[PDB]
Inverse folding.
């Protein structure tokens, strides 16, 4: 029997928002200490929760629903302080005309869709007829007045499709900041509690390697954008602005925002309004 | 509609034999120009042949069966000149006692299993009772006199299991070298012909990036083995010896060996004995 140690199974969001991080993991050689899995954020969260991954990114809403079973990594997250550029509401009408209107929710999202619902109800006062469908701006606009998108599809709606076809594109990060003055966190990195307790060292080394890879990705954002632009409708400048508008910090200001968002949606999203976020303790 | 250009879909053998190359692809940043797929060599060959990949490693036997539809990359392959360490025959008896005996063939292999059959029949003169099964030395040894293994399972049989349980482990690379004096090639890198013709630049850049990643992996072999040893029953010295015993060249001497092997097995393995190997041509300037 081969009872040797086994690499941690690590999820990774396939979208552009984590492409610089993937660059960092590869350039540092960290990838060879992972058994990596790429998917969309809702799938990666499902996989970590059910045990098909040991460590990975978790969309915030799904993390809070499973907070007792997850240990969040400090000082890294997928967030924003103001605009996030790639979490948006695309609408053919002003937001105050969406009461009773058909609003499409991209299936790949769990946190942005909930944040959009929070804003429309509690900030703008509209009660739309929501439905979930795969992300597709062309099809969504034919069946609904507005659509909530994340990832590359939202970046394309914001940078390309919206301007071309004269559609309003609302940045969810900006709408949240206007309403609360706070930054926002869409996803955290977490280890399964059972894995963190079985392998405290590997979990710590994975966390430290993510920080080192994130730090390197910030320093070489220009190189990453140049290479990534060759395979996208986006150009180098647009990607570089997107990569640098994204906020990957996860300290006290970011937890402050998580706390307040959890309070406003918790009782209606399946976790206590005062849900406890357990963070990986340093040595 | 997003009509932008799309990354080539590139296969990669998950075994240790291509772990240094994976290190190279990551350190150079090449991975961010690929849409990578990791699997075992027989699966990757099926995927490239059926069109689920654009470029990838192809076990030689499967490449030769589809040679008209594949374009091989020059100057990189998975081969050996003498021992390969991770393509073996594990046997409880001397090889000359395997006539009519049960011999198990690891499912993940296509070329080593054929080479083992060629050697046992044409060099040693035994006609065993072959059967194919998933790679598992413990299960294979209770049901058969000998077993053919590749990859990490063969490296484990050669370095650990064999010595512990007193089993003979024959290196297929060495047996071929003894018989012919030639090196051997187990897998090549190839692009689908339709993809190579639709995207000559991307194919060329992928080829050049593989060479650059391979070269870097050779220079940093010690680092790769140190890191990889932490997740293996093998130690740093064993991995470094394995990485440096592997021969990743694919030039005239290696093509010579491919030609002769194809000649000896072709008519009984589903391709002409004189099958034509088309190589990716470099650009004129
Ligand atoms: C921040 C972005 O989008 C995301 C990322 C992760 C999770 C979610 C979600 O809504 O669950 C959204 C981006 O693409 O920049
Ligand atoms: C060379 C090794 O094994 C291989 C690699 C690729 C294909 C095959 C095959 O037999 O089809 C075997 C090694 O593991 O070092």
């Amino acid at each position: 029997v081969d009872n040797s140690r086994t690499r941690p199974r690590v999820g990774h969001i396939q979208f552009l928002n984590c492409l610089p991080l993937y660059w960092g993991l590869a350039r540092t050689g960290t990838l060879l200490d992972f058994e990596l899995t790429k998917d969309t954020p809702e799938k990666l969260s499902e996989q970590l929760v059910r045990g098909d991954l040991d460590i990975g990114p978790v969309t915030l809403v799904e993390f809070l629903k499973n907070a007792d079973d997850l240990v969040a990594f400090p000082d890294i997250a997928v967030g924003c302080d103001g605009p996030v550029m790639a979490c948006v509401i695309v609408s053919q009408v002003p937001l105050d005309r969406l009461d009773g209107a058909r609003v499409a929710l991209g299936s790949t999202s769990r946190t942005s869709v909930r944040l959009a619902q929070l804003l429309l109800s509690e900030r703008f006062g509209v009660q739309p007829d929501y439905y979930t469908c795969p992300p597709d701006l062309s099809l969504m606009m034919q069946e609904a007045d507005a659509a909530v998108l994340i990832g590359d599809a939202a970046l394309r709606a914001n940078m390309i499709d919206g301007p071309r076809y004269g559609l309003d594109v609302h940045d969810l990060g900006a709408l949240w900041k206007e309403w609360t003055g706070l930054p926002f966190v869409f996803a955290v990195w977490a280890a399964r509690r059972d894995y963190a307790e079985r392998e405290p060292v590997i979990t710590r080394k994975v966390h430290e390697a993510f920080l080192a890879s994130r730090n390197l990705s910030l320093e070489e954002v220009e190189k990453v954008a140049e290479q990534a632009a060759r395979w996208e409708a986006f150009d180098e400048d647009t990607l570089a602005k997107y990569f640098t508008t994204l906020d990957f910090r996860f300290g006290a200001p970011q937890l402050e925002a998580v706390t307040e968002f959890a309070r406003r949606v918790g009782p209606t999203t399946g976790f206590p309004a005062d849900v406890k976020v357990e963070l990986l303790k340093p040595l």
Summary: Residues 1-81+184-283 of chain A form one domain. The radius of gyration of chain A is 19 Å. Chain A has two domains: 1-81+184-283, 82-183. Chain A touches chain B at residues 2-7, 19, 22-23, 25-27, 29, 31-33, 138, 156, 223-224, 227-228, 230-233 (CB under 8 Å).
